[PDB]
């Protein structure tokens, strides 16, 4: 019974990722005055299937890896952690009801940086490793604000339990009392997942960005699936955190429908943003974190520790 | 370093030691050591050269290993007593680990190899901190746990330290290496008397610090780090050679100078406990230290080594180093024996 | 066998330690420590330390060990020697697992072994507490008390971290 | 003064993010000491009963200790219901 | 050491309250008001004695009071009560605030048919005083007699005789 | 809005905590009997 | 003692032997130093949690924080050594022999 | 048990996808190709961003208990020490900022 529950989470996750690739191409297409995939299947509905089959029967790349074990471990870690991030999410009921579910999600995401580091180590390329290290420095930098922002919001929720965020927002979305934190949270999730305008791993300033450069890599599909599973998951987390959906215990499906729409819309905004802006320089996105978000996030953390005390609005512990 | 940052770092070195000395909780003692180690590394690195980097690395590895052993002893003590109070330990394994951890921090033999190398690799002012202030925290801990210390272990560490310090200093021409082996030898006296009368451990520590501080300050005044560069002092600042002579004789433990007092009072306490062989062995072995102190006095004060022509240019300029507290320290280093009964203020 | 989860985890804990203590290439040394840390958190969880366990993952694995691997890549290793392809590394690894295997053998068979301390092999579950029905987590209450009971701890811990930033900037400037 | 106002103008033009950060932090440190409802936070935290309220042995002269939970004596939570 | 004294299985036998936690949660507020006296005697015994073997008689009276309390509900208010705890039982957290409509029906029933008034917010957390005939335990920890302190040092402080007396020093 | 809702949640928490307090005497009495029975049963098998 | 302590104490002993028996990389020895702290964290947490020493629950956190800060200092020294020599080999740190 | 089953299932599937991603291409039997430590040099700046992350991350460990800390009776002490920690976190940033620890220009 629980084994069914796990598969009813894992398999739909992989299907959403597959069809998000189609949604991204069509949304980006129409914002660019074109259509995007509309030939492979009606409205391009078979395009994700054709891409998936094509990638898995493609020849593996050269050159050979520097470390076989790290070459294999990186994709396992990326995809294993990506799926694990979904198990405590309340939709409205979680697969695993953790008392410290928010902390679990922080802890698991901080481990996602290892796949970047290991794949750089296994690339057998000096320049590819330097690219991986720049990506790691970006990831960990923006982890600082995500943790501090998250801590600030929980001071209004009162615990680390994800389903308690639902109760906290029973009257009102947390985005109203905390829109300044929501703004910086949303950007941090973009930078955390290496999404435009923070997608420097796919940019023009890397030592390995040159088309004619080569290094050990892959499989491409597995890394791609892991990344897009995190995009959806972060936007699901963003909805729960700031756009809490009302839960009726006798009609849980209504929560799920409304909660799914909000997550979809937030995910579409990632695509919206990718279509709209140029790319940051590496030093400029570091400046954005260390000299803008971080000073303001520390100040707002001070404020949100003090505010419940001075208003007599401390939330309950249980 | 920015002078304000240098002041803050020195105050943190002191804060770490003060935390060790006022803490009633083993965790706070451990924190004091951690804070102290963190703050002292920059002053060792401050002149930026490969030798200073090697010394900082060797010091870091030694101290970090010692601090992990200290924490292991504390946790074992918690498991067998359920409490954290800084006092006698309640498990013999915890006692051995903490004693070894503190011996490593002190640089006692046979955990001594780092002291000569680390002292040689850092500036004189840093070496002064390393060989004086850094002894205060480990000694203050040993002062409180001594009832649970294994007698054979602590006396073995003391005997080895006196032997190794005496023999190690004989082969040295570098002033910083001489002071390092002198420190190791003087360490053995402090721990040897600890089981019998911890007050005499404090007396020896205070007088050792004063004499060592005097020596480093005089070495800094003329920027001398080798025996031969010190042998030019007679032809620049003759008074400094006389002061160096008096202090070296005092460190040698010769009556009627101050340095005899700790040796005299330690011998008394050990004999009251029917320990005759050990103080006699220690007193005789200390003649090794007197020998390489006397060798320095020969090349500095009692003979005149060859000078250089360019020394004439130095005659035209005054000493401008601060030499803080030097007149007071040198007097205390030499003329305090008539006030020996004042040691009761340490009780 | 699930009733010996703690002991089984602690065996894996030791095996990981023998991993990086035989000191293969730093790249794989970090892997042994990461696995040991994850197993270490698992042991702490099974004693009721949920917050403490997750701190290991967040701070020790997601923080300290990430920085170790970051530094290893830049300053130490870029490609490794094959694990256990060196005489000393393999001999040290074999020696460690033999010692662990024999400790495990005698503790399970005689239900007790004795090295420095006396160890009992009945099962770690036997020492657990039989009374629990409070409406909160005792561990969380103790950690939360840092801000009420532990004013002095916060000051010195806060000062040490600030001094750490200053010191490391001093050390790495190079002039 | 007017030198002070000019300085606040230059930072508000060049460093609005830092001006906002110091303003928000300043309120965090000042308002709690001025708020009248801060006292209620302490009272509410003390009105939350985590532990069983162990009864007292009635020696015979504790007039202000209720014998039954619904007796008038003892601390009231009337202020909390209205708050 | 001695033999740990344990009561016989027959001495431990009581009629249990075999109802679920949702039933107990639903009745908890009225149960706390109605059965306060035997419950508080039991809790005073447990904290004073610090030994469950010393409070078994008071523990049985806790059960008998509870059984008579639920017999009153089964006698006059079963249907409103059954509706109330069935709503409580649905919630994964057994939340009171989801069932205020059924709670009101149950509270109205017990007030009319039994006179029970639901205690107000804060009442059940009061420290109360209980009358008891059980004497106050004299040595609940079974402590041995404490060791005698060392003799006090008293009298006036006088200067040391002939000074420090350290070797040759005359002061 | 957050202040009002968190005040109400604190009042709801006190209600939940007081329901537990009302039930603790019954739960304590059961636990003591259960513990004593298990120890008595272990003792009988120990004698055998 | 309980069985788990045997293995945690073995892990500390193993990492201590690993710390005292260097090879070449200074990095490999720092990992053994962090391994020592991890085993101390686990043994401290097990003792404190099992005994219900409530206020001591914060002690493992302070241990972890201070040990990580000391590990940052160790890594900084390693980088400065690697800058001087281009490797973190401990055999290049033998100038002070004389 | 459930959490262990979930973690095992998630990483088991990830492992199977990885190996079949590596074996399935071998069905094609593509032709053979026959045609192809030390500093990096590492910048000190990239090391210092990692170290700064760590020290900031350790201070965040001390701030995580704040939601529970607010339930205490000694709110004045708790609020004073909470703001003290965050302020020292700001002071660490200010020191880094004003000594050009956050620059990327060489
Ligand atoms: C709080 C209460 C007040 C206490 C103050 C604490 C120290 C902070 C102030 C010192 C910094 C300062 O003011 O100037 C910065 C300033 C930085 O600017 P900079 O010139 O650009 O940088 C140059 C280098 O940084 C440095 O220049 P340099 O490399 O050319 O040489 C500097 C040298 C030059 O100093 C000298 O002139 C030589 C004399 C110094 C040794 C005498 C100290 C006392 C000896 C013990 C007797 C107790 C008194 O001074 C030192 O060696 C620094 C360490 C001094 C402490 C030595 C440890 C003594 C052991 C204490 C044991 C106590 C228990 C006994 C039982 O430089 C200095 O002036 C340094 C000298 C400071 C005055 C003399 C030393 C301080 C006075 C002694 C205090 C004794 C308390 C124990 C201190 C323990 C520290 C770990
Ligand atoms: C309880 C307090 C009782 C003790 C009073 C201590 C006051 C001494 C303050 C002297 C001072 O300014 O230290 C500066 C001193 C710098 O002078 P220096 O390198 O030590 O050598 C003396 C200079 O020639 C002196 O250089 P100068 O030409 O600049 O001398 C002018 C200086 C006057 O400074 C002097 O006259 C230096 C001579 C004062 C005595 C040296 C301190 C001795 C402390 C007592 C030691 C106890 C001995 C143990 C007891 C006997 C054995 C049982 O004028 C003042 O600052 C008057 C002090 C205002 C307060 O640095 C420090 O002491 C702090 C760092
Ligand atoms: C410049 C002068 C500054 C002094 C004048 C200041 C005037 C204001 C004070 C008012 C005042 O006059 O009354 C205080 C004091 C007199 O006080 P009083 O109540 O009227 O009568 C005291 C009785 O005479 C004696 O009554 P008591 O026997 O019952 O009490 C003395 C007692 C306790 O008193 C003491 O512990 C302090 C002992 C010294 C106090 C003498 C005054 C200090 C100032 C002069 C220092 C010059 C040093 C000479 C340098 C030699 C070159 C190496 O002596 C002892 O038990 C210690 C035995 C000696 C320790 C030897 C340790 C062995 C290693 C050191 C050997 C080095 C050779 C000796 C030179 C070092 C000084 C001993 O001033 C004096 O006139 C001192 C007279 C000498 C008494 C010494 C006691 C016999 C021991 C002989 C040692 C040989 C050295 C003698 C040096 C004498 C040079 C003049
Ligand atoms: C592997 C590669 C990376 C993936 C690792 C994933 C995290 C590990 C699992 C830890 C989960 C966790 O802490 O959740 C707390 C969660 C949530 O804690 P909680 O307190 O919120 O809920 C527990 C239940 N209540 C509240 C009722 C008390 O704990 C649980 O759900 C119970 C855990 C049961 C015991 C688990 C034993 C196995 C532990 C193995 C740890 C990992 C082994 C090492 C792997 C290799 C190195 C990483
Ligand atoms: C939008 C205005 C209408 C408000 C709304 O979203 O409808 C609310 C409806 C049910 O409301 P509910 O959230 O369950 O209850 C609130 C108490 N917590 O919930 C629903 O109808 C389902 C959601 C449909 C309406 C979309 C609301 C979410 C919009 C998120 C937009 C994300 C934009 C990102 C911005 C950055 C990109 C530019
Ligand atoms: C009533 C009204 C109240 C609000 C009034 C506020 C008054 C102004 C506050 C100070 C404004 C900033 C001062 C300044 O000059 O900033 C400019 C400068 C940054 O310029 P920079 O980009 O580094 O220049 C390099 C060349 N390109 O700045 C710097 O170089 C250093 C600035 C470092 C600041 C870091 C602060 C981090 C903490 C954020 C705030 C959190 C609270 C801190 C604790 C305070 C509690 C009161
Ligand atoms: C109180 C009870 C305890 C008693 C213990 C004994 C106390 C004495 C120890 C005090 C501490 C030592 C300080 C003694 C002061 C020394 C004064 C001195 O010697 O003069 C220095 C002299 C000056 O040289 P210059 O710079 O050229 O000045 C010319 C002057 N127009 O410099 C020179 O000319 C160079 C001299 C050549 C070297 C001669 C070497 C022998 C020096 C003998 C005196 C040293 C005494 C120390 C040993 C203790 C003696 C008992
Ligand atoms: C029952 C409780 C027991 C508790 C003790 C548990 C710890 C001991 C169990 C082993 C666990 C694995 C730990 C391995 C650490 C030692 C490995 C090492 O780093 O040694 C390095 C050194 C060789 O260094 P290298 O430069 O590479 O080669 C030169 C040699 N030609 O090494 C060498 O020179 C060769 C040595 C390789 C063999 C290692 C044997 C173990 C070390 C001795 C421990 C003795 C005390 C144990 C008790
Ligand atoms: C059951 C599901 C199985 C998994 C199926 C996975 C199907 C993957 C289909 C991907 C469809 C193409 O999607 C598109 O791919 C290219 C990569 O070539 C990406 O391209 C991006 O990354 C590459 C580097 O990786 C850059 O060179 C490029 O400049 C950048 O835009 C686009 O951002 C993405 O929109």
CATH topology for H7-98 is Methane Monooxygenase Hydroxylase; Chain G, domain 1 (1.20.58)
What is the H or E stretch that residue E130 is in?
strand E129-130
DSSP-derived 3-state class of residue E1: coil
**Tokens standing for D54?**
């162990």
**Tokens standing for B71?**
């924490």
Phi and psi (nearest 5°) for G97? -45, -40
Share in percent of chain B as helix, strand, coil (round to 5): 75, 0, 25
Q: How far is C135 from chain F (nearest CA, A)?
A: 8
For β-strands C112-115 and C117-120, DSSP reports them as: antiparallel
A: neighbours with 3+ CB pairs under 8 Å?
Answer: C, D, E, F, H
CB contacts of C75 in chain B (<8 Å) are: none
Exposure class string for E74-103: b at 16+ Cβ within 10 A, else e: eeebeebbebbbebbeeeeebbbebbeebb
Cα dihedral angle (A29, A35, A38, A42), rounded to 10 degrees? 100
Ligand 6 neighbourhood includes H35 CB (under 6 angstroms) = no
Q: How far is H87 from chain C (nearest CA, A)?
A: 10
Q: What is the Cα–Cα distance from B108 to E58, expressed in whole angstroms?
A: 66
Q: End-to-end CA distance of chain B: give it in Å, rounded.
A: 41
Q: What is the Cα–Cα distance from B156 to B158, expressed in whole angstroms?
A: 5
Resolution of this deposited model, Å: 2.3
Q: What is the Cα–Cα distance from B294 to B296, expressed in whole angstroms?
A: 5
DSSP-derived 3-state class of residue E9: coil
The residues with which C119 forms a beta bridge, in sequence order, are: C113
Q: Is the distance from CB of B40 to CB of B134 less than 8 angstroms?
A: yes
Closest C-alpha to C34, from A115, A218, A67, A140: A115
Exposure class string for B66-103: b at 16+ Cβ within 10 A, else e: bbbbbbbbbbbbbbbeeebebeebbbeebbbbbbbbbb
Look at F36 and E40 and tell me if their CB atoms are within 8 Å. no
Class of domain G3-85: mainly alpha
Ligand 4 neighbourhood includes A99 CB (under 6 angstroms) = yes
What is the H or E stretch that residue B61 is in?
helix B50-81
Ligand 7 neighbourhood includes B233 CB (under 6 angstroms) = no
Phi-psi category of E165—alpha, beta or left, where left has phi over 0 and alpha has psi -120 to 50? left
Q: What is the Cα–Cα distance from A300 to B257, expressed in whole angstroms?
A: 65
Share in percent of chain H as helix, strand, coil (round to 5): 70, 0, 30
**Tokens standing for H73?**
């009776």
The residues with which E129 forms a beta bridge, in sequence order, are: D56
Peptide bond into C156 cis (omega under 30): no
Q: Residue holding tokens 């300033």?
A: A205
Q: What is the Cα–Cα distance from C65 to C84, expressed in whole angstroms?
A: 22
Look at H51 and G61 and tell me if their CB atoms are within 8 Å. no
Q: What is the Cα–Cα distance from G41 to C49, expressed in whole angstroms?
A: 12
Cα dihedral angle (C55, C56, C59, C65), rounded to 10 degrees? -170
Ligand 1 neighbourhood includes B3 CB (under 6 angstroms) = yes
Taking the CA atoms of A265, A268, A270 and A274 in sequence, report the sign of the dihedral they define: negative
Q: Which atom of ligand 3 is nearest to the CA of B256?
A: 64
DSSP C127: G
Look at D44 and F10 and tell me if their CB atoms are within 8 Å. yes
DSSP string, A138-154: HHHHHHHHHHHHHHHHH
Phi and psi (nearest 5°) for B308? -125, 160
* Half-sphere CA count of D7, side-chain side, radius 13 A: 4
Give me the domains of chain C, ranges plus CATH numbers: 4-169 (1.20.120.1200)
DSSP string, A208-262: T-STT-------HHHHHHHHHHHHHHHHHHHHHHHSPPP--TT-HHHHHHHHHHH
DSSP-derived 3-state class of residue D54: coil
Q: Please tell me the residue having the least CA distance from ligand 8 atom 30.
A: C88
In chain H, where the domains are located: 7-98
The residues with which B173 forms a beta bridge, in sequence order, are: none
Q: What is the Cα–Cα distance from A184 to A182, expressed in whole angstroms?
A: 6
Look at G27 and C18 and tell me if their CB atoms are within 8 Å. no
Taking the CA atoms of A163, A168, A172 and A173 in sequence, report the sign of the dihedral they define: negative
Going from the Cα of A225 to the center of ligand 9, the distance in angstroms, rounded, reads 10
Indicate the residue of B27, B64, B120 with minimum beta-carbon distance to G59: B27
Q: How far is A178 from chain F (nearest CA, A)?
A: 11
Q: What is the Cα–Cα distance from A216 to A60, expressed in whole angstroms?
A: 10
Q: Residue holding tokens 């953390």?
A: A301
Chain F: residue whose CA lies nearest to A318: F13
DSSP string, H32-81: P--------SPPHHHHHHHHHHHHHHHHHHHHTTHHHHTTSS-HHHHHHH
Q: What angle do CA B316, B322, B324 make, to 5 degrees?
A: 140
CB contacts of H90 in chain D (<8 Å) are: 25
Burial bucket for residue E18 (CB in 10 Å: 0-12, 13-18, 19+): exposed
- Is A114's Cβ below 8 Å from some Cβ in C? yes
Q: End-to-end CA distance of chain D: give it in Å, rounded.
A: 42
- Is F14's Cβ below 8 Å from some Cβ in D? yes
Q: Residue holding tokens 């300050």?
A: B217
CB contacts of F18 in chain D (<8 Å) are: 49
Going from the Cα of D20 to the center of ligand 6, the distance in angstroms, rounded, reads 9
For β-strands C117-120 and E129-130, DSSP reports them as: unpaired
Q: Which atom of ligand 3 is nearest to the CA of E170?
A: 56
DSSP-derived 3-state class of residue H16: helix
Ligand 7 neighbourhood includes B206 CB (under 6 angstroms) = no
In chain G, where the domains are located: 3-85
Ligand 3 neighbourhood includes B327 CB (under 6 angstroms) = no
Burial bucket for residue B57 (CB in 10 Å: 0-12, 13-18, 19+): buried
Ligand 6 neighbourhood includes D15 CB (under 6 angstroms) = yes
Q: How far is C123 from chain G (nearest CA, A)?
A: 6
What totals of helices (H) and strands (E) does chain D contain, helices first? 4, 1
What is the H or E stretch that residue C117 is in?
strand C117-120
Q: Is the distance from CB of E105 to CB of E80 less than 8 angstroms?
A: yes
F: neighbours with 3+ CB pairs under 8 Å?
Answer: A, C, D, E
């Amino acid at each position: 019974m629980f084994m069914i529950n796990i598969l009813m989470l894992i398999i739909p996750i992989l299907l959403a990722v597959a069809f998000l690739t189609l949604v991204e191409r069509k949304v980006l297409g129409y914002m660019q005055l074109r259509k995007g995939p509309n030939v492979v299947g009606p409205y391009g509905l078979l395009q994700p299937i054709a891409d998936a089959i094509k990638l898995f029967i493609k020849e593996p790349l050269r050159p050979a890896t520097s470390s076989a074990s790290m070459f294999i471990l990186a994709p396992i870690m990326a995809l294993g952690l990506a799926l694990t991030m979904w198990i405590p999410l309340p939709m409205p009921y979680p697969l695993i009801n953790m008392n410290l579910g928010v902390l679990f999600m922080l802890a698991m995401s901080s481990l996602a940086v290892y796949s970047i580091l290991w794949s750089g180590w296994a690339s057998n390329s000096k320049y590819a490793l330097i690219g991986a290290l720049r990506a790691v420095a970006q990831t960990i930098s923006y982890e600082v604000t995500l943790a501090i922002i998250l801590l600030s919001v929980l001071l209004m929720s009162g615990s680390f339990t994800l389903s308690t965020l639902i109760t906290t927002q029973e009257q009102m979305w947390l985005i109203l009392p905390a829109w300044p934190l929501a703004m910086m949270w949303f950007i941090s999730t973009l930078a955390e997942t290496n999404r435009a305008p923070f997608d420097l791993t796919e940019g023009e300033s890397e030592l390995v960005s040159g088309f004619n450069v080569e290094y050990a890599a892959g499989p491409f599909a597995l890394f791609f699936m892991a990344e897009y599973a995190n995009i959806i998951m972060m936007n699901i987390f963003t909805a729960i955190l700031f756009l809490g959906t009302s839960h009726n215990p006798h009609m849980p499906e209504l929560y799920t429908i409304n909660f799914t729409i909000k997550s979809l819309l937030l995910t579409m905004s990632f695509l919206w943003i990718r279509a709209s802006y140029p790319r940051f320089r590496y030093d400029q996105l570091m400046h954005l974190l260390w000299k803008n978000f971080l000073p303001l996030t520390l100040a707002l953390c001070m404020w949100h520790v003090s505010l419940p005390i001075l208003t007599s609005g401390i939330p309950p512990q249980t | 370093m920015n002078p304000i940052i240098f002041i803050i770092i020195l105050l943190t070195i002191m804060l770490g030691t003060i935390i060790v000395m006022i803490s009633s909780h083993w965790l706070l003692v451990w924190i004091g050591f951690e804070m102290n180690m963190l703050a002292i590394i920059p002053i060792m690195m401050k002149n930026h050269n490969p030798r200073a980097t090697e010394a900082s690395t060797k010091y870091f590895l030694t101290q970090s290993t010692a601090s992990m052993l200290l924490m292991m002893a504390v946790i074992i003590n918690l498991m067998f007593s359920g409490q954290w109070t800084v006092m006698k330990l309640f498990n013999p394994m915890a006692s051995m680990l903490m004693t070894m951890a503190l011996a490593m921090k002190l640089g006692m033999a046979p955990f001594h190899f780092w002291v000569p190398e680390v002292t040689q690799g850092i500036p004189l002012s840093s070496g002064l901190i390393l060989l004086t202030w850094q002894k205060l925290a480990p000694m203050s801990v040993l002062y409180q746990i001594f009832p649970s210390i294994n007698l054979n272990l602590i006396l073995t560490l003391s005997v080895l330290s006196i032997l190794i310090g005496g023999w190690g200093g004989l082969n040295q021409t570098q002033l910083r290496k001489i002071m390092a082996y002198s420190s190791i030898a003087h360490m053995g006296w402090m721990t040897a008397v600890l089981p019998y009368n911890p007050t005499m451990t404090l007396l020896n520590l205070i007088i050792y610090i004063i004499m060592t501080s005097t020596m480093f300050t005089m070495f800094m005044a003329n920027s001398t780090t080798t025996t031969l560069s010190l042998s030019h002092t007679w032809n620049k600042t003759p008074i400094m050679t006389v002061l160096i002579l008096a202090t070296l004789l005092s460190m040698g433990g010769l009556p009627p100078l101050s340095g005899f007092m700790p040796k005299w009072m330690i011998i008394q306490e050990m004999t009251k406990n029917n320990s005759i062989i050990l103080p006699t062995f220690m007193a005789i072995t200390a003649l090794l230290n007197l020998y390489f102190y006397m060798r320095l006095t020969y090349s500095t004060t009692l003979t005149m080594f060859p000078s250089t022509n360019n020394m004439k240019m130095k005659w035209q300029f005054p000493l401008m180093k601060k030499m803080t507290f030097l007149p007071t320290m040198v007097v205390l280093s030499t003329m305090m024996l008539p006030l020996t009964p004042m040691l009761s203020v340490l009780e | 066998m699930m009733l010996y989860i703690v002991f089984i985890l602690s065996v894996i804990f030791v095996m990981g330690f023998v991993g990086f203590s035989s000191k293969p290439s730093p790249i794989y040394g970090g892997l042994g420590l990461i696995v040991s840390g994850g197993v270490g958190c698992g042991i702490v969880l099974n004693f009721g330390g949920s917050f403490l366990g997750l701190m290991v993952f967040l701070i020790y694995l997601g923080g300290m060990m990430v920085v170790f691997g970051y530094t290893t890549a830049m300053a130490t290793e870029q490609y490794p020697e094959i694990w256990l392809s060196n005489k000393a590394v393999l001999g040290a690894f074999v020696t460690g697992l033999l010692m662990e295997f024999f400790m495990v053998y005698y503790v399970l068979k005689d239900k007790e072994v004795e090295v420095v301390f006396e160890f009992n092999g009945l099962g770690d579950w036997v020492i657990y507490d039989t009374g629990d029905s409070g409406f909160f987590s005792e561990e969380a209450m103790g950690i939360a008390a840092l801000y009420s009971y532990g004013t002095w701890l916060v000051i010195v811990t806060g000062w040490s971290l600030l001094i750490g930033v200053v010191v490391i900037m001093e050390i790495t400037r190079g002039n | 003064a007017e030198r002070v106002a000019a300085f606040l103008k230059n930072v508000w033009a060049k460093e609005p993010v830092l001006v906002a950060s110091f303003a928000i932090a300043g309120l965090a440190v000042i308002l709690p000491t001025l708020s009248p409802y801060t006292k209620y936070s302490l009272m509410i935290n003390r009105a939350t009963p985590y532990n069983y309220p162990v009864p007292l042995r009635d020696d015979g002269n504790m007039p202000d200790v209720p014998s039954h939970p619904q007796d008038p004596q003892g601390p009231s939570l009337e202020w909390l219901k209205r708050l | 050491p001695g033999i740990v004294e344990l009561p016989s299985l027959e001495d431990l036998k009581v009629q249990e309250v075999k109802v679920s936690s949702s039933v107990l949660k639903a009745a908890a507020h009225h149960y706390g008001a109605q059965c306060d006296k035997p419950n508080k005697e039991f809790m005073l015994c447990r904290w004073e004695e610090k030994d469950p073997r010393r409070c078994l008689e008071e523990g049985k009276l806790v059960n008998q009071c509870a059984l008579e309390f639920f017999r009153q509900i089964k006698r006059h208010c079963a249907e409103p009560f059954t509706e109330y705890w069935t709503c409580i039982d649905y919630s994964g957290l057994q939340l009171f605030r989801r069932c205020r409509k059924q709670q009101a029906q149950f509270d109205e029933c017990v007030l009319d048919k039994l006179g029970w008034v639901r205690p107000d917010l804060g009442d059940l957390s009061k420290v109360t005083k209980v009358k008891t005939d059980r004497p106050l335990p004299e040595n609940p920890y079974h402590s041995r007699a404490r060791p005698e302190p060392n003799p006090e040092v008293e009298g006036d402080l006088k200067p040391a005789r002939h000074g420090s007396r350290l070797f040759f020093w005359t002061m | 809005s957050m202040m009002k809702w968190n005040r109400e949640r604190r009042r709801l928490q006190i209600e939940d905590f007081e329901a537990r307090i009302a039930l603790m005497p019954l739960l304590q009495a059961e636990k003591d009997r259960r513990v004593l029975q298990m120890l008595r049963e272990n003792l009988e098998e120990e004698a055998t | 003692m309980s069985m788990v302590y045997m293995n945690i104490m073995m892990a500390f002993t193993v990492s201590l032997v690993g710390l005292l028996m260097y090879r070449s990389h200074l990095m490999s020895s720092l990992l053994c130093l962090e391994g020592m702290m991890l085993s101390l964290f686990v043994m401290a947490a097990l003792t404190i949690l099992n005994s219900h020493f409530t206020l001591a629950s914060m002690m493992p956190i302070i241990l972890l924080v201070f040990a990580a800060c000391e590990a940052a200092l160790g890594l900084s020294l390693l980088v400065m050594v690697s800058n001087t020599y281009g490797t973190d080999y401990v055999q290049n740190l033998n100038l002070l022999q004389c | 048990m459930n959490l262990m089953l979930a973690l095992l299932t998630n990483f088991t599937l990830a492992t199977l996808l990885v190996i079949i991603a590596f074996w399935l291409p071998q069905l094609n039997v593509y032709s053979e190709k026959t045609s192809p430590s030390a500093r990096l040099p590492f910048s000190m700046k990239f090391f210092l961003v990692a170290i700064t992350f760590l020290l900031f991350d350790l201070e965040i460990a001390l701030l995580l208990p704040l939601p529970w800390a607010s339930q205490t009776a000694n709110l004045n002490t708790m609020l004073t020490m909470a703001l003290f920690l965050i302020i020292l976190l700001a002071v660490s940033l200010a020191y880094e900022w004003t000594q050009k620890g956050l620059e990327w220009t060489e």
